[PDB]
Structures are given as C-alpha cells and as structure tokens.
Write an enzyme that holds these catalytic residues in place. Structure first.
Site, short mmCIF file in Angstrom:
data_model
loop_
_atom_site.label_atom_id
_atom_site.label_comp_id
_atom_site.label_asym_id
_atom_site.label_seq_id
_atom_site.Cartn_x
_atom_site.Cartn_y
_atom_site.Cartn_z
N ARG A 84 7.55 -15.98 3.59
CA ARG A 84 8.91 -16.49 3.59
C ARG A 84 9.47 -16.29 4.98
O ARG A 84 10.44 -15.61 5.16
CB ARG A 84 9.74 -15.86 2.47
N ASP B 53 3.40 -8.07 -1.04
CA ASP B 53 4.06 -9.34 -1.33
C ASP B 53 3.84 -10.00 -2.60
O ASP B 53 3.99 -11.34 -2.48
CB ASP B 53 4.27 -10.13 -0.05
N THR B 54 3.06 -9.63 -3.56
CA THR B 54 2.76 -10.35 -4.78
C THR B 54 3.37 -9.92 -6.08
O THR B 54 4.36 -10.44 -6.60
CB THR B 54 1.21 -10.65 -4.90
N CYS C 87 -8.37 -14.92 -7.31
CA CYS C 87 -7.77 -13.69 -7.12
C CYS C 87 -8.48 -12.46 -7.73
O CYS C 87 -8.51 -12.23 -8.93
CB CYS C 87 -6.33 -13.62 -7.65
N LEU C 88 -8.97 -11.66 -6.75
CA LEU C 88 -9.69 -10.42 -7.01
C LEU C 88 -8.71 -9.34 -7.49
O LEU C 88 -9.18 -8.44 -8.26
CB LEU C 88 -10.41 -9.98 -5.70
C1 HEM Z 1 1.11 -11.32 -9.27
C2 HEM Z 1 0.31 -11.24 -8.27
C3 HEM Z 1 -0.70 -12.09 -7.57
C4 HEM Z 1 -0.87 -13.41 -7.55
C5 HEM Z 1 0.00 -14.50 -8.25
C6 HEM Z 1 -1.92 -13.74 -6.59
C7 HEM Z 1 -2.36 -14.99 -6.31
C8 HEM Z 1 -3.48 -15.27 -5.63
C9 HEM Z 1 -3.95 -16.66 -5.31
C10 HEM Z 1 -3.27 -17.89 -5.89
C11 HEM Z 1 -5.10 -16.53 -4.64
C12 HEM Z 1 -5.99 -17.61 -4.05
C13 HEM Z 1 -5.35 -18.31 -2.83
C14 HEM Z 1 -6.19 -19.47 -2.35
O1 HEM Z 1 -7.02 -19.96 -3.16
O2 HEM Z 1 -5.88 -19.83 -1.18
C15 HEM Z 1 -5.32 -15.10 -4.39
C16 HEM Z 1 -6.43 -14.60 -3.70
C17 HEM Z 1 -6.65 -13.27 -3.45
N1 HEM Z 1 -5.83 -12.25 -3.91
FE1 HEM Z 1 -4.30 -12.36 -5.16
N2 HEM Z 1 -2.50 -12.55 -6.12
C18 HEM Z 1 -1.69 -11.55 -6.64
C19 HEM Z 1 -1.96 -10.19 -6.41
C20 HEM Z 1 -3.01 -9.65 -5.67
C21 HEM Z 1 -3.21 -8.23 -5.41
C22 HEM Z 1 -2.35 -7.11 -5.97
C23 HEM Z 1 -4.27 -8.14 -4.55
C24 HEM Z 1 -5.00 -6.90 -4.01
C25 HEM Z 1 -4.34 -6.01 -3.21
C26 HEM Z 1 -4.73 -9.50 -4.29
C27 HEM Z 1 -5.85 -9.82 -3.56
C28 HEM Z 1 -6.40 -11.09 -3.40
C29 HEM Z 1 -7.57 -11.39 -2.63
C30 HEM Z 1 -8.49 -10.31 -1.99
C31 HEM Z 1 -7.78 -12.70 -2.73
C32 HEM Z 1 -8.89 -13.54 -2.11
C33 HEM Z 1 -10.16 -13.85 -2.94
C34 HEM Z 1 -11.11 -14.80 -2.23
O3 HEM Z 1 -10.65 -15.45 -1.26
O4 HEM Z 1 -12.28 -14.98 -2.70
N3 HEM Z 1 -3.97 -10.37 -5.03
N4 HEM Z 1 -4.34 -14.40 -5.01
C1 PIW Z 2 -0.93 -16.64 0.66
C2 PIW Z 2 -0.43 -15.39 0.99
C3 PIW Z 2 -0.88 -14.30 0.19
C4 PIW Z 2 -1.87 -14.55 -0.74
N1 PIW Z 2 -2.39 -13.41 -1.57
C5 PIW Z 2 -2.92 -12.23 -1.15
C6 PIW Z 2 -3.27 -11.60 -2.31
N2 PIW Z 2 -2.97 -12.35 -3.32
C7 PIW Z 2 -2.43 -13.42 -2.92
C8 PIW Z 2 -2.44 -15.79 -0.93
C9 PIW Z 2 -1.98 -16.89 -0.20
#
Ligand code: HEM
Ligand code: PIW
EC number: 1.14.15.1
Length: 405
Positions: free
Chosen positions: A177, A242-243, A348-349
């Site tokens: 943002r 941020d999530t 999302c891991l």
């Molecule tokens: C409510 C919370 C969350 C949502 C809605 C969210 C959403 C997402 C989304 C939509 C993606 C894929 C983005 C893409 O395809 O460009 C992503 C990837 C990822 N998220 Fe989350 N996330 C959240 C929380 C978290 C948390 C708490 C962590 C760990 C600290 C995290 C770690 C990651 C990582 C490591 C990936 C990359 C996986 C890869 O590229 O193979 N996320 N997230």
């Molecule tokens: C834009 C910015 C943050 C992220 N994100 C990181 C972890 N989970 C979601 C994914 C796309």
C-alpha cells in the site's frame, strides 16, 4: 493519470480501474473491486491507470492464468511495472522448475510441522492479548490485536527483536500500500539493508530460527547464496507482517456487525473451521499479477509479450459464477470456492500458519468477549493495494458481559 492506450487494446475492453484507489472504497474494499464483476464489464479488461495493464475479472480466467506459467510469468508480478521490476522475492519471482527448490526450503520454515510446534505459543499469545483487553471495554483492534498477535509470533519464529517492528512494518506497508513517501526500490533496499547483516551473522553462527535455517539451506544440491537468502527472507517478512494482520481486521469488523454470526460460532464451535474458510472467501485481500512472456491469445483477446495482467486472488471467490450470493457470509455454504492463498505453483506456504492464527483468535475472542460492536460514530476505512487493509478498528463492549478464563 491515465496512460495512452497501446495499439493492440480494443477500446471496448478499456475499464479504468485504479487498484490503488478504486472508486467505491467507501462501501468497503471487496465491494470496490467487485465493480469489475458487474454485467457491463468484460471478463478481461485493460486499465490505463498505474501505467496500463490487463485485469482478469473472473475466477475461471484467474485460475487459468495462474496455472499457465509458460505464458503468464512471475518475473514481474507487481503493478506498477517499476514495482514488479524491482521486486526480486524468492520464490515469488520465479517460475517452475527453478521455483520448486526454493519453495521446498521456504516450506521447511513455515510449513505444517512448524505451526504444529508453535501452536501453544499462538494460543498463549492470543489469550494473553485478549485477557489484557477484556476489562477495558474498548480497543483499536488494528493496533491493539491485529498487528501484535501475528507479528509477535513471526518475530519469535524469525528470531528478530520486537523493537524492530515499527521500522519493518512501515517498510512492508510501503510495498503493498505505497504511501507516496518512498518508491518500491527504495523500500526494497531499506528492508534489504536490514536483513543483510542479520543473514551474514546467521551463516557464521546459526540459530534454530527461520533466518538461520534459510541462510544455511540447500538448493539444488549446493548451498543457497546470501543474495538468494536475502530474497527469500524479504518475502517471509511481508508474509509475517502484512497478511494475517489485514485479514483479521476485516473479519473482526464483520463480526462486530453481525451478532448472529457470532452466536452461531458460539453455540456450534464445530463450525469455526468452516466459518474461517468462508471469511477467507468473503474478505480475501491479495491482488497480484504476471507478465506475458510472448504474444498470446487468451479468451479471444490478444496479449502482447511484456503486457502485465493483474489476476486478483481476491475476486475468484466473490464471482457469482463460483459462489451464489457472493457478498453474503453463510457459514454453511456447501462449497466455499476461493483462491485467497493463490493458485497454481505459487500456492501459499504460510496458509497453515494463517488458518491457525485465525481460528485461534475467533475461538478465543468469542469466548471472553462474545458481545462487541464498532464504536458509535466510528467510520471504518479500508485501503487498497497489493494487500488491502483496514485503517483502524475502534471496538467497544460492556466489560460486564465478558468472561475471564
Ligand atoms: C491471510 C493471509 C495470507 C494470504 C491471503 C496470503 C496470500 C498469498 C498469495 C495469494 C500467494 C501467491 C502470490 C502469487 O501467486 O504471486 C502467497 C504466496 C506465499 N505466501 Fe502467503 N498469504 C498469507 C499469509 C502468509 C504467511 C503468514 C506467510 C509466512 C510467513 C506466507 C508466505 C508465503 C510464501 C512463502 C509464498 C510463496 C510460495 C511460492 O512462491 O511458491 N503467506 N500468499
Ligand atoms: C504480494 C505481497 C505479499 C505477498 N505474500 C507474502 C506472503 N503471503 C503473501 C504476496 C504478493
């Protein structure tokens, strides 16, 4: 600021959506984006804001583009281009098969097993925060709980000082943002300035913390570089800060307005998980994209190599073709269809960590503070960007109706 329309874009496909300041923001952020799904809007549109880019507006297209990494590349995943350009997070800026390895490590750090291990601190921190709030009859849910809860569990995991929060969070915020106060690269650089020294320190003298594992991890038989570790860590930071932070405020705002939703979860606790998915569907909040690796014709539209398209994760679940009465929160929906945690190889891991932190909060808050509402004359403001947020969440309640545990 609308940019001139490239030659390949049919004027009938133009819809000037500003992902950073949609029009109906006052109605709520999810409602503001859902204008993209009105009958007048074509399935795939072009906007002239934020430099011009495409937007897929339907769950079917978003999923398809998410699967198709051959065409839709993660190389330049953020709009505006400069932003997508400067970003170099791993594994987010890579496609398979290179992605896979880095992915595997990140999972070591955030996966199921880690959560399974942190559950008691999660539960511990939530009860402590809530009990501390309970007698006051009033907080700032955004600052009082939505921020600390998730953030302090992350800092614990990463082994970083709580003192760093304010500084980190500002940097993180600028990324999703953007304020106008700093550009993506400057923001990126500043977070990097932070990490570099930390990582160096943990390759020499390893801990058991997330950074230490990433810094010393193995990728494709060889050791991960410092630069690579910096780039994974940069991602983890944003994920932690941020999530879940933003998610919780949308859910708590919904809960503070729907007594009957609160009740249901109170008497039929078995529904919490179900509820959690529905809220993940309804209050979805991520919007990123991919860049075309070539000229490709998608659903009758010509995309030129180098075009960016936004594939809002947010929208899949709000799409009527996917969920009947999409803006309606019903904990008993037979099928909750969303792509809140993404789709395709980039799924999302951290989803496990996020679900655990949501369920803990609903279960624990509802126990102690069953009856709450938004403060009178409070005007709740949402914010849009790559990750949307709530600006503040002023809650009030009668302490006499709370329950100490
Ligand atoms: C409510 C919370 C969350 C949502 C809605 C969210 C959403 C997402 C989304 C939509 C993606 C894929 C983005 C893409 O395809 O460009 C992503 C990837 C990822 N998220 Fe989350 N996330 C959240 C929380 C978290 C948390 C708490 C962590 C760990 C600290 C995290 C770690 C990651 C990582 C490591 C990936 C990359 C996986 C890869 O590229 O193979 N996320 N997230
Ligand atoms: C834009 C910015 C943050 C992220 N994100 C990181 C972890 N989970 C979601 C994914 C796309």
């Amino acid at each position: 600021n609308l940019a001139p329309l490239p030659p390949h874009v049919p004027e009938h496909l133009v819809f000037d959506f500003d992902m950073y300041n949609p029009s109906n923001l006052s109605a709520g952020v999810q409602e503001a984006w859902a204008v993209l799904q009105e009958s007048n809007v074509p399935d795939l549109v072009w906007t002239r804001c934020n430099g011009g880019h495409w937007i897929a507006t339907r769950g079917q297209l978003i999923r398809e583009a998410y699967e198709d990494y051959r065409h839709f590349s993660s190389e330049c995943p953020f709009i505006p281009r400069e932003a997508g350009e400067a970003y170099d997070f791993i594994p987010t800026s890579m496609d398979p098969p290179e992605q896979r390895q880095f992915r595997a490590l990140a999972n070591q750090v955030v996966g199921m097993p880690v959560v399974d291990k942190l559950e008691n601190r999660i539960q511990e921190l939530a009860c402590s925060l809530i009990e501390s709030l309970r007698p006051q009859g009033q907080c700032n849910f955004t600052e009082d709980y939505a921020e600390p809860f998730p953030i302090r569990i992350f800092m614990l995991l990463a082994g970083l000082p709580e003192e760093d929060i304010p500084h980190l969070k500002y940097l993180t915020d600028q990324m999703t943002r953007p304020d106008g106060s700093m550009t993506f690269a400057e923001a990126k650089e500043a977070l990097y300035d932070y990490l570099i020294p930390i990582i160096e320190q943990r390759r020499q003298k390893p801990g058991t913390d997330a950074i230490s594992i990433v810094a010393n991890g193995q990728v494709n038989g060889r050791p991960i570089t410092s630069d690579e570790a910096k780039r994974m860590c940069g991602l983890l930071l944003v994920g932690g800060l941020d999530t879940v932070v933003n998610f919780l405020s949308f859910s708590m705002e919904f809960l503070a307005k729907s007594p009957e939703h609160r009740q249901e979860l109170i008497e039929r606790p078995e529904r919490i998980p179900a509820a959690c998915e529905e809220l993940l569907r309804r209050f979805s909040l991520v919007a990123d994209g991919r860049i075309l690796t070539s000229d490709y014709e998608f659903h009758g539209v010509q995309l030129k190599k180098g075009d960016q398209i936004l594939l809002p994760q947010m929208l899949s679940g709000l799409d009527e073709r996917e969920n009947a009465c999409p803006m309606h929160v019903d904990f008993s929906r037979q099928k909750v269809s969303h792509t809140t945690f993404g789709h395709g190889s980039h799924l999302c891991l951290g989803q496990h960590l996020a679900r655990r932190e949501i369920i803990v909060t609903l279960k624990e808050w509802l126990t102690r503070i069953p009856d709450f509402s938004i403060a009178p004359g409070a005007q709740i403001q949402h914010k849009s960007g790559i990750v949307s947020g709530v600006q503040a969440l002023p809650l009030v309640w009668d302490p006499a109706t709370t329950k100490a545990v």
